[PDB]
């Protein structure tokens, strides 16, 4: 980065991986729900 950055427990790759994992989990949940609907 630039200047002085506030220190975090998670680095930028780690936090972006966590964010992408949560996003993928939400999208997968929505897709599984949509697969459940229109069948029963």
């Amino acid at each position: 980065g630039e200047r002085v950055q506030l220190a975090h427990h998670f680095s930028e790759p780690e936090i972006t991986l966590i964010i992408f994992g949560v996003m993928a989990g939400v999208i997968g949940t929505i897709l599984l729900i949509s697969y459940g609907i229109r069948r029963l």
């Binding site: 980065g1 630039e2 200047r3 950055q5 506030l6 975090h8 998670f10 930028e12 936090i15 972006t16 964010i19 996003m23 939400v26 999208i27 929505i30 897709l31 949509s34 697969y35």
Partner: protein
Amino acid sequence: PLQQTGQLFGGLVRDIRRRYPYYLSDITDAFSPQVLAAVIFIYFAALSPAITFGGLLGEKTRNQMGVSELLISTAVQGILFALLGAQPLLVVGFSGPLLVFEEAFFSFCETNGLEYIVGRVWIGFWLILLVVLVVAFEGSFLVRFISRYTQEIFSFLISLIFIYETFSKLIKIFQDHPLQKTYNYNVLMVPKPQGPLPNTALLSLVLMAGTFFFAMMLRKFKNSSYFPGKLRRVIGDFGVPISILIMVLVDFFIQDTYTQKLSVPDGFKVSNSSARGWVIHPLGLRSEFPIWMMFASALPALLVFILIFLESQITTLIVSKPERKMVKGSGFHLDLLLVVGMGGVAALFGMPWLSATTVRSVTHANALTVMGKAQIQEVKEQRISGLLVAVLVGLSILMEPILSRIPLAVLFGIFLYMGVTSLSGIQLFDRILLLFKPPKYHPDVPYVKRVKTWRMHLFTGIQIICLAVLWVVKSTPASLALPFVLILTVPLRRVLLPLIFRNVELQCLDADDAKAT
């Protein structure tokens, strides 16, 4: 392309199966000098808006996002879109509504003590979530309801905006250096002239008018009957590069008079080295980013997605009309996914999100279109032109000695040429010209010979009302509501118009492929 399959990502796969079989021709068909002339045209047509919007963004955001970020984002997104997108003729770049949203978001963050760049990072994070769900459920199938009514309203309004901005830049030049009896002969030039200068506004007007005149004359010469046909078509295809070179030389050989030139940054660095790095921490750069703004970013992300979706989908509709001889297909699902995903990813690095701009894409498609013996013959549908445009836009920082000798006035003439030539295929522009023609001079087209003249003029006047309503909204602080008001034309066409028009009248006036019902 707009069919709703009911299969998850079904439109995306069909868009992938539609265009990628044609991948080999997408490189071979670009082996013509017309493609090179189109590359030279679209390089400036994409670089100059990039520089202008980058300077404006840097001034309005304290160089958090500036010229260099916009150039790099434009280059990378254009390269990845040309190499992967289903409609390579689109030009990915920054637009006016995007700048307005950036101003609004910077104001909101400056009010509430939020970090602007981190908020943009989270907006881009929420952007990818929306577009993935849209592509998954084939939300790009709703673009089948954007008939020629909305397409032509949007395209004509955007062309008028482009022409108005082109003229207002010259007005601003005349305001900065007004015509006076006496001047100060020693005025500081760094960074920009601090006072009015002689011969500047008039030379800018001369260069702009000369560039426009040369471009139009060479466009006429393309269709003319002079010279051998091959040489004539070669020179006509290179009309814009020839005009640019002529006027650049004209300004170059006038050493004394000052004319504003193209300005590119020194290197591939951040615009504010004390504000942010190349990667922005989602949790905060200086202060701990609030948890609520991580969830509250969805609504601005919704507005950004609506803006980008409408712009890109309507641009794809316009550049891929059947009457333009597009026989290679366009992917609404793939292009939207690539554009919005690239914008969301570029947000993570403090770089702007881009969209398929209407004027640049239309100009690119026109420059790649071959005319038969008045009749559209074929379109140079290929990936090389957009790829080279994006590469040159990225390399603009390296070629500063070449760009530093190009006045803005020449590019203003090029902009005016693009604006006036983008009105060719618009039937709304044709029907506006019929307001000032006697009915006996109307051409033999389905909306003329099966509709009464006053009915056609009423239909055109209804669209003119919509154009005025949209233009007023643009010049108001609520200029981000333009996509919703534009969407409001669709209920007008599909509900209110049948109450006052017959089916045959609407079929002739609002036709999918200019057919007589």
